[PDB]
Amino acid sequence: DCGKPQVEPKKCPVVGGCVAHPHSWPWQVSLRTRFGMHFCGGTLISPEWVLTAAHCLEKSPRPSSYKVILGAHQEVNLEPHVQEIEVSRLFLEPTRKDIALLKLSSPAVITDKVIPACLPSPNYVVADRTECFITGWGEGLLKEAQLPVIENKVCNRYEFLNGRVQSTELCAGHLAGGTDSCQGDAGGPLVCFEKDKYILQGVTSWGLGCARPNKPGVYVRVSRFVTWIEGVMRNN
Numbered sequence: 001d002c003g004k005p006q007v008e009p010k011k012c013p014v015v016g017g018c019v020a021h022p023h024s025w026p027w028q029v030s031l032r033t034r035f036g037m038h039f040c041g042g043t044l045i046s047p048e049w050v051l052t053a054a055h056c057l058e059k060s061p062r063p064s065s066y067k068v069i070l071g072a073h074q075e076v077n078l079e080p081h082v083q084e085i086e087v088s089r090l091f092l093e094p095t096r097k098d099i100a101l102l103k104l105s106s107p108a109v110i111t112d113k114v115i116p117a118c119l120p121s122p123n124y125v126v127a128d129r130t131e132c133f134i135t136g137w138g139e140g141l142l143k144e145a146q147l148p149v150i151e152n153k154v155c156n157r158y159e160f161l162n163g164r165v166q167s168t169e170l171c172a173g174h175l176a177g178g179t180d181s182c183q184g185d186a187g188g189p190l191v192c193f194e195k196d197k198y199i200l201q202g203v204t205s206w207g208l209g210c211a212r213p214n215k216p217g218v219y220v221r222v223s224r225f226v227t228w229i230e231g232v233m234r235n236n
């Protein structure tokens, strides 16, 4: 059952934002080096598959360099029931896009704290001003922020990101500054509530800094990679 947290998320009263309600984002994963240090996020999209950013894997093409922590809220002292699962294979997107799949060495156990996010339909375009959520441990409690999507044609204006955003990316952010995903959130989810569940629409990718005025974050547009993702899962 994807996209439906058993523990309901709360909105705020990651730079800025607020601490998430514990386990309300049950697809959020922490990507760690074999040494155990958190450095990137990811999203569980099925029991055996995590989606992350390709740049998070820049340091090593060896699956043994990585492990995934599922079900966590605190980053350092992992709570008793947290799942640590190794990675058996890495799949970088084949056209140098900032997205990648991790096949876990064993399927995650689905529980009230470990649940996959839903994937969008191919080529869906999140509408301008849609309020979505980003989550992560970045720049030790899991944080969230609610940010509005900014349509690419506005985001690509000189006043904002000046032609840098591709159709395979989306923009989201508060243009006054102060609230944003940042480095340790890379690879993690941008999700949007659709009808009754959360759909993974973006993968935290890059920005001109973090939380700066007129510089919204850039996310890989997951809907442009669903067909590729499905083919990798089907054939591996």
Ligand SMILES: NCc1ccc(CNC(=O)[C@@H]2Cc3ccc(cc3)NC(=O)CCN3CCN(CC3)CC(=O)Nc3ccc(cc3)C[C@@H](NS(=O)(=O)c3ccccc3)C(=O)N2)cc1
Pocket: 055, 096, 097, 098, 164, 165, 166, 180, 181, 182, 183, 184, 185, 186, 204, 205, 206, 207, 208, 209, 210, 211, 216, 217, 218
């Ligand atoms: N929500 C804010 C937020 C900010 C950062 C992060 C963590 N992620 C990074 O660190 C990324 C890592 C990255 C991502 C994608 C890359 C290459 C590298 N490649 C394509 O996806 C390949 C396809 N193609 C490439 C070209 N682009 C389009 C897409 C267009 C463009 O210009 N892209 C661009 C890319 C990288 C950078 C700058 C610009 C450098 C740096 N930005 S920064 O200002 O120096 C910085 C300093 C301090 C703190 C944060 C940022 C920056 O973000 N690197 C999470 C969240």
